[PDB]
């Protein structure tokens, strides 16, 4: 009533004050500033490998940290570990539930994590004395499906779920240590900072939030999209990120200045982005649209400089190695592809 | 080739065995019939499972050397469009509606009742873009309570524009035609209907017939003869 009205009014005043103080710090767009350097030449990328063996739609993939091994997950119910240089298969892991949406691969190479549409995140151990891959742990405690999961180190994992909640877990105990709350709708994606002390998340209320792993508090809020947020990623510097909407638009948000930097869209694109990624020097922004092909934007001038057209269904996942050698794309036709 | 050493000619063999096991395990998942079950809460879903019993919930049974597998999504209550494209290649959708409950109104809101909310849900799931060629089996549940409930209250509370004598068969026909009308394709979709009840034992034959029909038409479509 009275207290509710006063709280709502003061919150609106603070929102207006935040918007004004964000408006005051802008003098020149990044476009005016970058009107000097010459454009990169048209990027001619061609397919080198093609990795086949999945019998259904592919939903996620993740590059290893030695830049030679990757993992992929499909609705078939299997999780496969490949070997890009020779195309061979190292491991094929059966699953107890085939409704997967997320896979992640440890930054040391011992564990993999999987999950989706079951409310449960599973941790598998790859290096055992018995010769097989066995399920190591089963983290339960969410209420909606699992949208993303990332390893923070070998014994700490952060997940995001479709009940407006992210959680940080100790794997050995099995229990949440911190819960991250404050969004309105389903949380769709998260990305970790290069130092792994911050991470951003993006949800279906057209907003993105900058958290804090230590203290478990939301520190900043970024808005401006007009629809869902399907993908997000940090700049290799760790001081900006790029958001991939569902209204056929990408955006670049700045951390220290907390303001929108530029917009990546074109008048022939009317279908939403399903994945974004960066280049090792932070110049090329790769975006995977669902008109069946990827697009390569020059991140300092917002100009297309190539097209990776080799798929015949929706592109669902996309990623660049840690040394910037190749890019991999997956798709709903059950094929992975690798580009130099 | 000859570029390979004695420890790169064993990784290739291991990969080939992985491949044959994957391909052999993809055959056992192509000779099962997958059904997606849907309903409006207190609408006989559990009872239908009981006649057919052996987050996501699973049922897995057998009938006449055919093997059915049934997915129940009641306890999700998330945003629907972010996971409804997962059930894209299901053979059929089993929709359970309760016609013995037309009078009672929503617990959340005394204004709107069971029937119109269920009709809206059916409309949403029928004209979806992922299910433009997936069939819908429609179970009308609890036909005992309808018999004893129709005598007191005329259905003009739920259907003001209907002219009837408030008897069983004409009201049941009116309900089924009102449900089958919401279909907007009429060409690449059919909506079967069956009046169920507690103590039936006959609610597996109907599903078997409907899925045999769907499979026959899929086969005709594949060879182009259709």
């Amino acid at each position, epitope marked *: 009533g009275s207290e509710l009205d006063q709280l709502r009014q003061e919150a609106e005043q603070l929102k207006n004050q935040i918007r004004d103080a964000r408006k005051a710090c802008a003098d020149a767009t990044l476009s005016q500033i970058t009107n000097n350097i010459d454009p990169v030449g048209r990027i001619q990328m061609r397919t080198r490998r093609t990795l086949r063996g999945h019998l259904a739609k592919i939903y996620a993939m993740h590059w290893g940290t030695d830049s030679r091994l990757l993992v992929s997950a499909s609705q078939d119910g299997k999780l496969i570990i490949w070997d890009s240089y020779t195309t061979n298969k190292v*491991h094929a892991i059966p699953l107890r539930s085939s409704w997967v949406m997320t896979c992640a691969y440890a930054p040391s190479g011992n564990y993999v994590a999987c999950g989706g549409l079951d409310n449960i995140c599973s941790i598998y151990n790859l290096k055992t004395r018995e010769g097989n891959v066995r399920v190591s742990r089963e983290l339960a405690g969410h209420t909606g499906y699992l949208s993303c999961c990332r390893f923070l180190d070998d014994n700490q994992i952060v997940t995001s779920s479709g009940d407006t909640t992210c959680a940080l877990w100790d794997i050995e105990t099995g229990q949440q240590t911190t819960t991250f709350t404050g969004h309105t709708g389903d949380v769709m994606s998260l990305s970790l900072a290069p130092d792994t002390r911050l991470f951003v998340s993006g949800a279906c209320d057209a907003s993105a939030k900058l958290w804090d792993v230590r203290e478990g508090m939301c520190r900043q809020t970024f808005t401006g999209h007009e629809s869902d947020i399907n993908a997000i990623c940090f700049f290799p510097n760790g001081n900006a990120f790029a958001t991939g909407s569902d209204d056929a638009t990408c955006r670049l948000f700045d951390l220290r200045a907390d303001q929108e930097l530029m917009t990546y869209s074109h008048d022939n694109i009317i279908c939403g982005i399903t994945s974004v990624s960066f280049s090792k020097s932070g110049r090329l922004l790769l975006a995977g649209y669902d008109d069946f092909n990827c697009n390569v934007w020059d991140a300092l001038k917002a100009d297309r400089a190539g097209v990776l057209a080799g798929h015949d269904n929706r592109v669902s996942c996309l990623g660049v190695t840690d040394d910037g050698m190749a890019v991999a794309t997956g798709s709903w036709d059950s094929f992975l592809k690798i580009w130099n | 080739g000859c*570029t390979l050493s004695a420890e790169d000619k064993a990784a290739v063999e291991r990969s080939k065995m992985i491949d044959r096991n994957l391909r052999e395990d993809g055959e056992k998942a192509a000779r099962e019939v997958k059904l997606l079950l849907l309903g409006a809460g207190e609408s006989g879903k559990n009872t239908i499972v009981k006649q057919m019993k052996i987050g996501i919930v699973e049922t897995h049974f057998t009938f006449k050397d055919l093997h059915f597998k049934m997915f129940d999504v009641g306890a999700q209550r998330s945003e629907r469009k972010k996971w409804i494209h997962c059930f894209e290649g299901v053979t059929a959708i089993i929709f359970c509606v309760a016609l013995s409950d037309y009078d009672l109104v929503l617990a959340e809101d005394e204004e709107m009742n069971r029937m119109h909310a269920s009709m809206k849900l059916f409309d949403s799931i029928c004209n979806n873009k992922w299910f433009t060629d997936t069939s819908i089996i429609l179970f009308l549940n609890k036909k005992d309570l309808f018999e004893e409930k129709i005598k007191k209250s005329p259905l003009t509370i739920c259907y003001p524009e209907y002219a009837g004598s408030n008897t069983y068969e004409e009201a049941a026909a009116y309900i089924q035609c009102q449900f089958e009308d919401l279909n907007k394709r009429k060409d690449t979709k059919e909506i079967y209907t069956h009046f169920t009840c507690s103590t039936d034992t006959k609610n597996v034959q109907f599903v078997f017939d409907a899925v045999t029909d769907v499979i026959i038409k899929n086969n005709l479509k594949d060879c182009g003869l259709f």
Partner: single-chain antibody, 232 residues
């Protein structure tokens, strides 16, 4: 994890016999398996190999046409059948696990051994020294040399160092050139180039006393360097 084989005994020069190993503890159906022999007061040499899935079988030129290797995969028991027993076939037989994929470590676990007495080209690896007296606390270096290059085009060089203590079966120490085996102290290190290789022990204790072997894995047959002992 364990491998227990049996079948040994004393047999006449004209005869045939069988050896069988029982494999309890691991996934026996995804592990290639070797048989390796060691003569009485002499080094040890490779005998046979059977793949995972019984696809490929390799033998030794000295033994081809007399030995048959087979599995029993449901029951986890692997057999070697010997049809002619010359008087120089007396040895002690070991059965060896090995798994190949990217990042593996073949020759991990090394059975327990079964004696057998009998009544009465190839890459050459050489170890120059035969005995190295030493005292605890000081480093030791052991040398292996080959007759041609082990550095393949792909980038790997297939050299293995492993140890045998008295009254005990051997165990992997180092794989490839510098990779350290599972559960060994970090005191051991190894390196080399081309056709020369050296193993170094920085510290020293009373458990390092024993014999050391260097082996190659470019092509079958697999050959073993002679035995070098290290005394206290």
């Amino acid at each position: 994890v364990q491998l227990v084989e049996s079948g040994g005994g004393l047999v006449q020069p004209g005869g045939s016999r069988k050896l069988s190993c029982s494999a309890s503890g691991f996934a026996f159906s995804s592990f290639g398996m070797h048989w390796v022999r060691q003569a009485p007061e002499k080094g040890l040499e490779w005998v046979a190999y059977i793949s995972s899935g019984s696809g490929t079988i390799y033998y030794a030129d000295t033994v081809k046409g007399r030995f048959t290797i087979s599995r029993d995969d449901p029951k986890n028991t692997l057999f070697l059948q010997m049809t002619s027993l010359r008087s120089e076939d007396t040895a002690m037989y070991y059965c060896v696990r090995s798994i190949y994929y990217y990042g593996s470590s073949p020759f991990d676990f090394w059975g327990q051994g079964t004696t057998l007495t009998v009544s009465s080209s190839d890459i050459v690896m050489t170890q120059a020294t035969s005995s190295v007296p030493v005292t605890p606390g000081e480093s030791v270096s052991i040398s292996c040399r080959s007759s041609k290059s082990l550095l393949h085009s792909n980038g790997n060089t297939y050299l293995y160092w492993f140890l045998q203590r008295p009254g005990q079966s051997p165990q992997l120490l180092i794989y490839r050139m510098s990779n350290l085996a599972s559960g060994v102290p970090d005191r051991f290190s190894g390196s080399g180039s081309g056709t020369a290789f050296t193993l170094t022990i920085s510290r020293l204790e009373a458990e390092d006393v024993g014999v050391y072997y260097c082996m190659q894995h470019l092509e079958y047959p697999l050959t073993f360097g002679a035995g070098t002992k290290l005394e206290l």
